[PDB]
């Protein structure tokens, strides 16, 4: 039950240190290798570097020796450090396991074999943005259901930056949930929406509460959605 969890600040100033943490769950960190992969918008996913079981990290040479990958044994976490970051470092960060395969074609005595690495297990992935702009908390407004199957939702207005995790009843209702993507207004702030399909008889009996969490703003909002007074 190996689960990788990406955790980061999501917003760092240029020419500073970027810290990302990858959490290992259902296994130890001394059996397989670990690697970091980022995906910048407009470009493909990029291989950053890996760390072996002997605590000897290897990085991609096209980073000018600015990346540092470390791992802890008591807490089972994989750290990522990047110094002198630039706004081009804005990318979705993925941490995945590195599986060492050995392709053998001839006699092993002469080293007639080359190792190849494949990433079997990946993480969900966190979004990190590098910019000098400040942060801005979201505004959660409960979209009341119409009186006339009914539909209700919650409106998350302007915030910065992405992403925003939205759940319903702390994860107790998953059917009919449709979280629409946010819009990029001319002011430079995102605003998304999230609705859920529930029967009309549930109105007046169920306590529907949408949960909004924004990690860069360190704000978790719980809003109780109730119909209008008419």
């Amino acid at each position: 039950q190996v689960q990788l969890q990406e955790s980061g600040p999501g917003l760092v100033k240029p020419s500073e240190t970027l810290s990302v943490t990858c959490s290992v769950s259902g296994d130890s960190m001394n059996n397989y290798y670990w690697t970091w992969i980022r995906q910048s918008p407009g470009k493909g996913l990029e291989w950053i570097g890996y760390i072996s079981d002997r605590e000897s990290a290897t990085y991609n040479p096209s980073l000018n020796s600015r990346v540092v990958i470390s791992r802890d044994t008591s807490k089972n976490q994989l750290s990522l450090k990047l110094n002198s970051v630039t706004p081009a470092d804005t990318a979705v960060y993925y941490c995945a396991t590195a599986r060492r395969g050995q392709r053998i074609y001839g006699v092993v005595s002469f080293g007639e074999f080359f190792y190849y690495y494949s990433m079997d297990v990946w993480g969900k992935g966190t979004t990190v943005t590098v910019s000098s702009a400040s942060t801005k908390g979201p505004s959660v407004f409960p979209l009341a259901p119409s009186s006339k199957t009914a539909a209700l939702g919650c409106l998350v207005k302007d915030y910065f930056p992405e992403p925003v995790t939205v759940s319903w009843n702390s994860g107790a209702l998953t059917s009919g949930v449709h979280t629409f993507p946010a819009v990029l207004q001319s002011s430079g702030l995102y605003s998304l929406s999230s609705v859920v399909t529930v029967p009309s008889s549930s109105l007046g009996t169920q306590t529907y509460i949408c949960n909004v969490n924004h990690k860069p703003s360190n704000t978790k909002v719980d809003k109780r959605v109730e119909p209008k007074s008419c």
Partner: protein, 211 residues
Amino acid sequence: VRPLSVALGETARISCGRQALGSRAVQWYQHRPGQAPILLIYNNQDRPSGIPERFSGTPDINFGTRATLTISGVEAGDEADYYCHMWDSRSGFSWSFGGATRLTVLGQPKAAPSVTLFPPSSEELQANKATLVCLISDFYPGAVTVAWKADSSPVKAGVETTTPSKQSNNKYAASSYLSLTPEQWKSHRSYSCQVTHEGSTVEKTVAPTEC
């Protein structure tokens, strides 16, 4: 990025960018936008647990063949970006994943869009703000023109429209945002969200004078 368009049910073969140089061990990766990348084929043709048998690789019979990912029975869920990771002895350590191959599935059955216009909430009106949310879900193809209308005249000011995006049902989903002031929301008789899809038009209307 290299484009590719394949119909439904036909056996497609995604070609590889770079070629082999000696004994090779090819890895084919499937990446969905916003989700975790998942490799389909590792080491020529070896298939990990969970991958269906519709995907296949190229045998390493000492050169003579090109590493190709054969996909039989291409359905709607195969639309993604595919990378070819070549591992040969001559090239040594391969860091780049090759040129991206964006696979697009054509001939999908169209679906009528489900439009739902939501008025600004009462708590948002207390914040001296207003926003009209018009959501469009489940529609194909991904070509929808959104036009906001105040009463009978269209409004081009304060219109924030999103690009239609695919969701889990292989149908597109779009959302439109109309930023207004509380006085402008309570002044007009009724607001309407006009959605045009494949010539057809579905319109939702909300009014402040109706519960």
